[PDB]
C-alpha cells in the first residue's frame, strides 16, 4: 500500500559524482540532503554549499553560483575560517547507511553542491541528492 510519495516530497539529483546540478527550491519551502557513497573513502571529503538567483536573462534559468553565508546555532563554538557554510562528510562510511544534512537558512531559489578543493579525487565516489517537503504553490 505504498503511497505515491513522489508528489508530497519529491526529490532531485544535486551531485551525481561527475558534475553538480542546481535544483529549484522556490515552489517548495523545506529541503534537505541525503549524502550517499558507493565505494570506500579516504581522508574526509568536504562539500561547498551554493545558492543561485534567477538570471535576469530569463526568470526561469538559474544564474551564477554564489556561496551561502553560514549561521551558527545557540551553542556553536567551531566557526569556519570564513562564513560560507560547508559540509565535511566524515570518512569511514560504508555503503550501508547515509547522512542527512541541510542548511538552516535558505536564501535563493536554487541550491547547489560542489566538492571543495583537495577532495575531488575522493569526491567522485559520493552520491548526493535533495528532497523538498512543502507544496505552497
Amino acid at each position: 500500500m505504498n503511497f505515491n510519495v513522489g508528489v508530497d516530497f519529491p526529490s532531485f539529483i544535486a551531485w551525481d559524482g561527475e558534475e553538480s546540478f542546481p535544483v529549484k527550491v522556490d515552489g517548495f519551502n523545506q529541503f534537505g540532503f541525503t549524502f550517499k557513497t558507493i565505494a570506500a573513502l579516504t581522508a574526509a571529503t568536504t562539500f561547498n554549499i551554493f545558492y543561485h538567483e534567477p538570471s535576469d536573462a530569463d526568470p526561469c534559468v538559474p544564474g551564477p553560483a554564489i556561496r551561502v553565508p553560514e549561521v551558527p546555532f545557540c551553542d556553536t563554538v567551531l566557526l569556519s575560517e570564513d562564513g560560507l557554510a560547508a559540509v565535511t562528510l566524515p570518512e569511514t562510511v560504508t555503503p550501508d547507511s547515509f547522512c542527512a544534512g541541510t542548511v538552516p537558512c535558505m536564501n535563493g531559489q536554487w541550491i547547489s553542491i560542489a566538492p571543495a578543493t583537495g577532495s575531488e579525487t575522493n569526491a567522485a565516489n559520493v552520491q548526493i541528492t535533495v528532497t523538498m517537503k512543502g507544496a505552497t504553490r
Binding site: 549561521v71 546555532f73 545557540c74 538552516p104 537558512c105 535558505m106 536564501n107
Partner: protein
C-alpha cells in the same frame, strides 16, 4: 526655532529563523531649524503750513 523630522530610517529586517541574533538597523535623523523676523519701516513728513 522649530524641529524637523528628516527621515524615520529603516529599523529591522526580515531576518531568517533559527538565528539567535538581531540587527541594529539604521537610526533616523532629526534636524533643528530656526528663522528670524524681518522689519519694514519708512518715513514721511509735511510742512505744517499747508496742513493748517
Amino acid at each position: 526655532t522649530y524641529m524637523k523630522i528628516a527621515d524615520y530610517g529603516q529599523l529591522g529586517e526580515y531576518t531568517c529563523d533559527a538565528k539567535c541574533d538581531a540587527e541594529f538597523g539604521e537610526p533616523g535623523n532629526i534636524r533643528h531649524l530656526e528663522g528670524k523676523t524681518y522689519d519694514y519701516r519708512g518715513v514721511f513728513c509735511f510742512n505744517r503750513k499747508n496742513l493748517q
